[PDB]
């Protein structure tokens, strides 16, 4: 089926086809450029009068009205299986690593229905990250859905890179990384880092970064997800799915929304925000056939968690790491909110009675410190009771012991990174609550691994 371009409006293209020869919605349509090369566009809306409105997957500059458009007869299909491992891809499933062809068995379409209710289950086993604040207060689950919330420049990318360094290094199964609407520098940094460590051989990489037009940023996560879905269903092996940043899928949809003919919703967003998010998100999951441990960076515009995009995303997660700027502004890294960060597996049944009690004890001390901050600021420190003065002292030490130097952030911290086991983390915060380190200064707790390292650091001061 052949068509003709009648309008070009930025990333949107209207194509008139012959009567009774219309491409279905989500079909890939190729257009030969005048300059040279091929432009793939995806069918979005059937406007009427045999016209199909399409979202382009690359630049529409150079196009002319009247050019021929060819219906491929199916959605955007991309390579799957072990041929994708070690390779770097774009939105269309083409290799961008300059290492020859991709001899794949099959090519699956990027669009797909979500799994059945019968296929799904819950994630109960704990996944050790080696990061103190996460493992204690809001631990991740194996085959579960993890979300890394944060504002602009609070530490989502540094955190997800550390989780790759800690979790994916000694991982028996396979991995997938999806670069969605973020910095191309960081894709190059991560590729060469994975190449040096040897993790590249276990990992399929896809990139559709913020240089690209919206259509590329809209569908690049599906390209990566389709590869992860193969490793879950077809092969019998565990999968790690890293996405940075999933917000850019929603933003990409918001860019094309008004040009597709859709009236705007609240806060400048598309009216189909929740439906578009759900139909992508519900595919990202573990099933009875296989396990996907998904870790997704989630941008919070204007540091506003009430924003429709991050607010709607909260429903799709089993654990949430809530980054806040006020902690990052002090130098507390990772800047994890100890109260607002949550997990479905934070309970005595999973992590034990001691872990839950210590974790809850930390939250009550830090909650009481926040209630006193506004009182102390005006009326002074010495007007408090002896109980509250001790709570303030321990809260500030706890807050600093929640900080940690990362392996991937040595160029920012200026010191070596540290891995801390869970049983060691629980022991450290327990001794601080009991009052065994009340004579150590605050800086001793700042930027260390174990509680033993805090005792050693206090001697230097």
């Amino acid at each position: 089926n052949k068509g003709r371009i009648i309008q070009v409006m930025g990333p949107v293209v209207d194509i008139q086809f012959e009567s009774g020869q219309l491409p279905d919605i989500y079909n890939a349509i190729t257009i030969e450029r005048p300059q040279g090369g091929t432009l793939t566009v995806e069918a979005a809306v059937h406007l009427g009068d045999n016209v199909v409105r399409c979202v382009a997957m690359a630049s529409t500059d150079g196009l002319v009205r009247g050019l021929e458009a060819v219906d491929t007869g199916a959605p955007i299909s991309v390579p799957v299986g072990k041929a994708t491992l070690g390779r770097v891809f774009n939105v269309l499933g083409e290799p961008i690593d300059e290492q020859g062809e991709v001899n794949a068995e099959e090519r699956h379409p990027i669009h797909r229905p979500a799994p059945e209710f019968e296929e799904l289950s819950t994630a109960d086993e704990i996944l050790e990250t080696g990061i103190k604040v996460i493992d204690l207060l809001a631990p991740y689950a194996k085959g579960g859905k993890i979300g890394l919330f944060g504002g602009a420049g609070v530490g989502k990318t540094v955190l997800i890179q550390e989780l790759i360094n800690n979790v994916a290094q000694e991982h028996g199964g396979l991995s997938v990384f999806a670069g969605v609407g973020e910095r191309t520098r960081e894709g190059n940094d991560l590729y060469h880092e994975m190449k040096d460590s040897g993790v590249i051989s276990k990992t399929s990489m896809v990139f559709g970064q913020m240089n690209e037009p919206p259509g590329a940023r809209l569908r690049v996560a599906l390209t990566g997800l389709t590869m992860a879905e193969y490793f879950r269903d077809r092969e019998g092996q565990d999968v790690l799915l890293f996405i940075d940043n999933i917000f850019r899928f929603t933003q990409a949809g918001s860019e094309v929304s008004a040009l597709l003919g859709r009236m705007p919703s609240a806060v400048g967003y598309q009216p189909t925000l929740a439906t578009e998010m759900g139909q992508l998100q519900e595919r990202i999951t573990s099933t009875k056939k296989g396990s996907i441990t998904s870790i997704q960076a989630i941008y919070v515009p204007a540091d506003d968690y009430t924003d429709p995009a991050p607010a709607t995303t909260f429903a799709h997660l089993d654990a949430t790491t809530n980054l806040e700027r006020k902690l990052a502004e002090m130098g507390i890294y990772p800047a994890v909110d100890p109260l607002a960060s949550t997990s479905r597996i934070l309970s005595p049944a999973v992590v034990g009675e001691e872990h839950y009690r210590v974790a809850r004890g930390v939250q009550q001390v830090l909650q009481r410190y926040n209630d006193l901050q506004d009182i102390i600021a005006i009326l002074g420190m010495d007007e408090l009771s002896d109980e509250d003065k001790l709570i303030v002292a321990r809260a500030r030490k706890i807050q600093r012991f929640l900080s940690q130097p990362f392996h991937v952030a040595e160029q920012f911290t200026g010191m070596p990174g540290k891995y801390v086991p869970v049983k060691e983390t629980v022991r450290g915060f327990k001794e601080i609550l009991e009052g065994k380190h009340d004579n150590l200064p605050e800086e001793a707790f700042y930027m260390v691994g174990t509680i033993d390292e805090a005792v050693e650091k206090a001697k230097k001061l």
């Binding site: 008004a258 009236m263 609240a266 806060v267």
Partner: protein, 57 residues
């Protein structure tokens, strides 16, 4: 000492009585600023939605 203590606590009554009256004055000023911003935010948000809808039609 007892007379000086009486003077101390009397002086604290007055000072913290003023600080209470000053806090209520400031709390009203902040409540005016809040409701100025709340009304302005809703006015702007709804105006941008309606402006966006009129651009299509």
């Amino acid at each position: 000492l007892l007379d000086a203590k009486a003077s101390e606590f009397g002086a604290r009554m007055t000072a913290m009585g003023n600080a209470t009256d000053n806090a209520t004055e400031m709390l009203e000023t902040l409540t005016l600023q809040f409701n100025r911003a709340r009304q302005a935010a809703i006015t702007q948000e709804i105006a941008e939605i309606v402006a966006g809808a009129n651009a299509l039609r």
